[PDB]
Amino acid sequence: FVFEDCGSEVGKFSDIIISSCDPSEEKCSIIRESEIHVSMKFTPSVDVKNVEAKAFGVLLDVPVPFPLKKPEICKDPDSGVKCPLKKDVEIEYKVTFFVEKATPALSLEIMWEFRNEKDEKITCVKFPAKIK
């Protein structure tokens, strides 16, 4: 599978690593009730003063917003990322999450966006996933 670039005007990403999957696979398998580690190496093309993360499930064409624990990643001590972000410097974001038992077993596309303080996309990635 491909970590696809869904368009970002003030940045790019170079590598994504999701602990439960290899990109040699048809989809990213996400196991309910296990800890998943995510890494994203990215570079803003402007100085960024604050980062807001957004996650989306894509079920049947439409991207649907899904809440995150700490979406202000510069203010979360576990992110590895501190603001301000210097233009043209590559840095690494890390997050551990845990998929809840109550999460439905389905195939879907997952979208993750990083946005600056101006609501402009620094990064936008989308990838095919299967829960359970």
The residues near 13 (Cβ < 8 Å, ≥ 6 apart) are 3, 5, 40, 41, 42, 43, 123, 125
Q: List the domain range (segments joined by +) for residue 70.
A: 1-132
The resolution, in angstroms to one decimal, equals 1.8
The residues near 49 (Cβ < 8 Å, ≥ 6 apart) are 83, 84, 116, 117
CA 130 to chain centre: 16
Strand partners, 129: 28, 108
| Pairing mode, strands 121-131 and 28-30 | parallel
User: Distance between CA atoms of 120 and 46, rounded to whole angstroms?
Assistant: 11
Query: DSSP for the chain?
Result: ---EE---TTEEEEEEEETT--TTSSSEEE-TTSEEEEEEEEEESS-BS--EEEEEEEETTEEEEE--S---GGG-TTSS--SSBPTT--EEEEEEEE--TTS---EEEEEEEEE-TTS-EEEEEEEEEEE-
Structural domains in the chain (count)? 1
Which tokens sit at 82?
A: 């501190």
CA 108 to chain centre: 15
* Cα three-residue angle 89-96-46, rounded to 5 degrees: 20
- CATH code assigned at 52: 2.60.40.770
Which tokens sit at 47?
A: 């100085």
Residue pair 45/10 in contact (Cβ under 8 Å)? The answer is yes
Q: How was this structure determined?
A: X-ray
